[PDB]
Amino acid sequence: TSIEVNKQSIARNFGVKEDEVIYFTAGIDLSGFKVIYDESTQRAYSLPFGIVSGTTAISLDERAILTHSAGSVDLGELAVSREEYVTLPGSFNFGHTINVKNELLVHDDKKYRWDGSLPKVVAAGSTPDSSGGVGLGAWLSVGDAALRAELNTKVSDGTFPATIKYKYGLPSVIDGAIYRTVQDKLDDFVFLEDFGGKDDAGSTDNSIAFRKAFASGARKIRLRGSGVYGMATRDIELPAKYEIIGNAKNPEIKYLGTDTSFTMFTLTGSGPASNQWKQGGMFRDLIISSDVKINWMLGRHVQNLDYDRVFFYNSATVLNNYHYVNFTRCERWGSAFIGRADLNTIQFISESPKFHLCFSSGSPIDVWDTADLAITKCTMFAGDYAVRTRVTQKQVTAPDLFAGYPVLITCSVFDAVRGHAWDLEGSVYSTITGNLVSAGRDTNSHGAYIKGGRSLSLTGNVFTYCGNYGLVLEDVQQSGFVGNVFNGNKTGGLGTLACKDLSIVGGSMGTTYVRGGYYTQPVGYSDISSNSTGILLSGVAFDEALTTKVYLDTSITTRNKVINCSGVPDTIARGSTANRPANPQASYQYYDTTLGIPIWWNSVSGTWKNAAGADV
Amino acid sequence: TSIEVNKQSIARNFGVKEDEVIYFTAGIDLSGFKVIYDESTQRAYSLPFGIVSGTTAISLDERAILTHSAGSVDLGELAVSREEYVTLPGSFNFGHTINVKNELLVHDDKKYRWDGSLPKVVAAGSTPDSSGGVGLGAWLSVGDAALRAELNTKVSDGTFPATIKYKYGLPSVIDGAIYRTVQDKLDDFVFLEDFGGKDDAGSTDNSIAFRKAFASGARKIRLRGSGVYGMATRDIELPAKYEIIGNAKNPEIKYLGTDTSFTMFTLTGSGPASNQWKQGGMFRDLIISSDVKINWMLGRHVQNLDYDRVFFYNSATVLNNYHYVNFTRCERWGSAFIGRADLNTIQFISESPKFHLCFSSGSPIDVWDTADLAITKCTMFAGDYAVRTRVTQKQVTAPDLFAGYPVLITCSVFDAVRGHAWDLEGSVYSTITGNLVSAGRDTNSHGAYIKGGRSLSLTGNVFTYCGNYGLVLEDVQQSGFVGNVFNGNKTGGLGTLACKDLSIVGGSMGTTYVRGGYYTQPVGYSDISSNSTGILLSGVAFDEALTTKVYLDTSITTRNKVINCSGVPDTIARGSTANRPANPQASYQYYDTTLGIPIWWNSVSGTWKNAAGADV
Amino acid sequence: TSIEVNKQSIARNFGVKEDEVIYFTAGIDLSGFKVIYDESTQRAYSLPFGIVSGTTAISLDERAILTHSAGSVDLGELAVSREEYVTLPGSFNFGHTINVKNELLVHDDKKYRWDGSLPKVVAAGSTPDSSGGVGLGAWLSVGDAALRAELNTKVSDGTFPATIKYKYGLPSVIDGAIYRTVQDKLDDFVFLEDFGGKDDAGSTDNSIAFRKAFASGARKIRLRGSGVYGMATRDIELPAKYEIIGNAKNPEIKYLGTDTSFTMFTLTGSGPASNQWKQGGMFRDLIISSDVKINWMLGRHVQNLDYDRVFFYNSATVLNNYHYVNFTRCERWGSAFIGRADLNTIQFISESPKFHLCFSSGSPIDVWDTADLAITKCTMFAGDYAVRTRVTQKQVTAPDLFAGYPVLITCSVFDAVRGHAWDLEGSVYSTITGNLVSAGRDTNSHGAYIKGGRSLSLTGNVFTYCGNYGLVLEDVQQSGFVGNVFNGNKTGGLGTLACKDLSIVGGSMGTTYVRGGYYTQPVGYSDISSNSTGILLSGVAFDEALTTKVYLDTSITTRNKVINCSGVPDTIARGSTANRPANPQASYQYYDTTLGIPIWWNSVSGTWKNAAGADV
């Protein structure tokens, strides 16, 4: 009487009543019962709900497919939906045959069911991956052990952020916000740390991190740390339109080696033509440093570079054939700017390095063959010199008489420079306005020295306490110098050597003995070698205590003249009869030293007359 | 014997011994046994531990709430704690009656138990959500299938980031750091990509993304890509204090259509009054472009706008009734600035568009009725003109005599402009300092042209290689011009037309033949139409090779005078007896052309005398 | 029989066939069976696969260790791998003895198994933590309830982001990208919100948030909100090189209290020396505000501070012993700058506060003992005054004659200031170029007032519609004033008091009656108290309608002279015979009022001669 005791045990397993279990036998009414039993396979299954009266059984096969008068039903599938499983003996490794959807095969302490066609044979030595894979239509993991292992794997294998859907502003419903992944959202920013960058002061070679970061296509790179990012691999080529952003000017990009030939970054165009200049980028909010003097960056055939709030230390910037470069709010310590143009084989010219709101100590600006160097609202302290311009090819062919380029220096301060604050050769169409200069004391040098200048304006500047003259002009022609003050300089205020057609107007020269440093300036203006012509002094207020206010040949032939300069005689038209003006205007007065009388040109008589009206 | 075989199967189910299972009937000693059985419901339950001797059973009700001599216990609740469940036949959808806390009802292949008040019937077609919801006191999901679906759902529906607690710096314990969600932390930044923005070169209409981003309340928007963000929907109104940030000047916000009337963005105040001006914002580090010429942005009744490191291409900025606008470090290619004020019906004025550290090619600045337009440390190349100012309405009511506004142009470069670099009408109280101008060669135009000027200063500029005159002043009164250089211009250096009371001081005029371009300038200064009065030339250094140094009527009545200009005689008081000064200063010297002698005014005798001292 | 019905119940439990269950007894062939049963313990276990024929049982102990002729097997271990468990009665709290690896003990409705040595006895009142902990070799949680609780705990306790492995750019394989955690990646940025900051208008004290954020080592802090961040705790000391970034100038950092002595932030160096100055940082893109007037920030012994795109409201910045401070693109409303240097006990000097592209209304700049205050491209409106400089120690010791410092003011606009636009004391080597000034109308004050000035240049400025004089110089020596325009001022254009050796050149004075406001200026230049010497006026274009063009004593001893000023007589050499010049230059012309004739000094004869050449 084995059957009803079997029905009892099955009922206890399924938590149903004893009379709700039935053996499958053909033709029976399946209605009302909740569990059916197969004698051949000795497997039990829950029956689908709502089997109506008169529904009779036809067949029940190895795959737990139950066929009856009303239709068919997969009891294996139903068991799965109800999480009623049988865990088969053995495992994937030793092999087994899967016949039913609710049969589980253990692999590595984890359970899997087959979702594909049945029956399914797994050979000995199989894995779920080795026998059809994991997913719909294949192996599907079941239960606690499998889930725990899978959760641990995906969280720790790096795939999880890509799986997590993200929408900005959730749980709030925001119109237009789209679904992305947490991976993608996080990828919105790139830090050097993402490529192995570390501010561990030389343990990590951050040069490599930069290289790999840029190689990925990234352009805008942030530094997380406040420490030193050591750089040990030279000549990392920057991509076009880079932007490297430090952590609020805290971290350092630093070379720690001893090789002065080391260079951190290169920026390199394909050629000298404008369509070959590589587009530059931004360095900002960081320190660029080296213990030894280096050229930290080398730029060749480049355009549109920016440096903003960068602290440079022993780190010179070298550019050759460069066009439009901004240094803004930078602090330059022992960090020269070196501008060249010899790589421009087309025009041999570079353009517009610009400095604004910068502080410099021991950091010269040295540009050759460069047009429109501009320095505005800057302070420069110490160094051998502050600003230097050079022209490499000085020879010209007629009708050209001179070669040079404009510089624009405005409302800037140049202080305690050891040599010249300004050492300007080939300065043409330059405007130099409202600057303060105090330089050259350490080497007895002029505060500013312009050698080779044409058609420029130097306006409203102050030159004080310089090591020689405040300003010396050598080989400067057709230029204007108005409103400048020349105070307390060692040897003189303003000096000229072999100049032609200059206007020197207003301003003041002398010594005001202001606390903080001055020499007793002995000379006001001097044409030092007495070989300039067309030098015009008008309205200059000279300190009466000046030993020599003006040193200048103002005889009739030199075209040098003085008008209304205090302590200095007005230039009078005078000289021998031979030196009478050839084509004087009407009523022109000339003191004839031969005759010892004033004479006047009479336009009507076409003769010189004395005051009595008689011809001489 | 059905009772002891049932007890055995139950024992095997719970994994206890056979003599540790008991049937419920009143009065029985419950001690020592581990599982109790209910004959009526045919359900088995674990017994609570530590039931001591002499404790006997009293009742066992509908829900396995068991009452005995020591007290009562909820075996259903106990079963839950032990995860010992019964999965009911059928499902939620077919409807069911839930009776016990350890009973599970399947919905969608997932199991749920009821945690609230019992019993409760679920109707056919019900879900956990439709029948009391999911949570404490309600439906609680149970088991593998439910957990897997919930985890899978939660990860992919966007709700997961909000569930993850985040605190900055973990696992390090950082004082003051608070718990947020990963969702909140991620929402700290807004990218255009978050609102469907895509740099797919015209496939996505990013105008919509901008609109929806701003509507959410977002103000500061970043661009992730380095490609082209197409813009196809015109006139997107910006919110107050926007900030749009490109990816290190790599990506383009670009109009790809052919409609020249297209505009990307509008900024619009509520009215003309100062309390109605909409506060502007920042565009930075990006390209704004169009293949056809457009006004990319239209601003009306606006204040405090900024553009920094923006590359403009064929994209004009049009502002009407605007107040304080900054262009810094921008590159303007074929991208005019157009400023108007006719929408200001209160004061009819716009204020302070400012340009600093900008490069411009073919990009004019054209402002009407605008005060304090300022251009500093800028470079402008080509175009029909560089700077133009206009006063739309010129009428004055007496005693007003003139209408105009100041412009401030400082240390800037204007090169190869086709027409005038400066075309300035209604320039009043202007300061123009240390600029370099070379313009007008293509159209035979003056480098700079000021028509209608009052009380301005133009100081220390250089005008070289211009298409006509370097600078022409027409209808300019009571203004100063010191230290300017006028070199190698086609027709002349400096010209005046119908001017009154001007000072022209120092500087220089001529040609220095510097390599790079020049004309042989034929004229220095010319009062071209001989109709100016009170024109004073002092201390100007002229190139002696100049064909015409000065063209000016300096006869006694004109108030025009020259002093210390090289190659030009000092202006002498001269003329007929009829033209003797009416009230001369003491000892006034006058050359009388009628008499042909110099005469001197004696203040004591009140007469003109000759040099011999006789009255004439 | 009891044995085969037990075998049946076991078979139904494991889902195997009845003849596949066998009882353990020594010597029996274990081959073919799938489940073995221990009658002593009344426990059933699955058997390992591949037990071959002729393999006979030897022993089976309490730990379910099975020994047979071929070898041994741990059935408890096998059961775990197959997830076939027995849940023991009771719980951790009541204590139990764990015998088999597949035995589970409940703690707090969650299940655990023992992975360590067996047997394992847990005393009453135990937890998994109290009895060996959780992990390999110890307690391991099992099943649904345990997993759900662990997932919920880990997700909500803040530890989850640290567990999620992250690599930039996944699933794309990017060379050089390294694995990090989601926690670390999120930690790349710091927002004030991360430390409890909230823009809830005074409910949250954000001062504390800043303090704790900075204490963590964070330097760069962002503000998420657009609202008001209330600040209620004074004197938060900033770290070196902070950067506080607002949300596109939307949010306010605001003091909402009523204590006018309140200060938000301090920045404090360790001493007066340069290596002790605390390195400053950046405030940008935000509003700093207060309802009452406060000094929002106090800086002492500091260097290199920046404020960019900051809107100040009632918030004065007070710095003492400060060096290099930038205000760029700022808007200052009722927000003075106060600079002092008395804390510098070494040199008593502060350096270079600089203002660029700023707008100010009612916000004076007040610096004492400060060198190189620089204002460029700025607009200042209203206030009692705009710019004031003072020197604290005015006494000097011979040979020093004066004490002062340079200011550099360039291309800036000063409008409708109630008092002086510039109130400059101790101005030395200053350059003031291309500015527009209209001030003092409310208090009948000069537009600009320099009291105590040496060796400075004031060039190409416009002074219009001022409340008194355009500019008054008191105790100014050896300075230049060229190209300035003085228009429509109430009392006069340019005035001097006790000055010495000044050049006043070109420019223009008068009234041009341009719509927008003017006075009828009555005076051009006036030496108001007739006590200046060496005052030189050259080439100034005066409005002919001026009542007084020049008021100046130009008698021979004063060294004051006028040349080429319209409507003003040239200073000519004249006087009595006794007053003939001692040591005259060659050909010197002198009008002798005694004789009533001009005479000329002949250098050869060493005599004065008349025009006829006879000695007088």
Ligand SMILES: [Cl-]
């Ligand atoms: Cl002589």
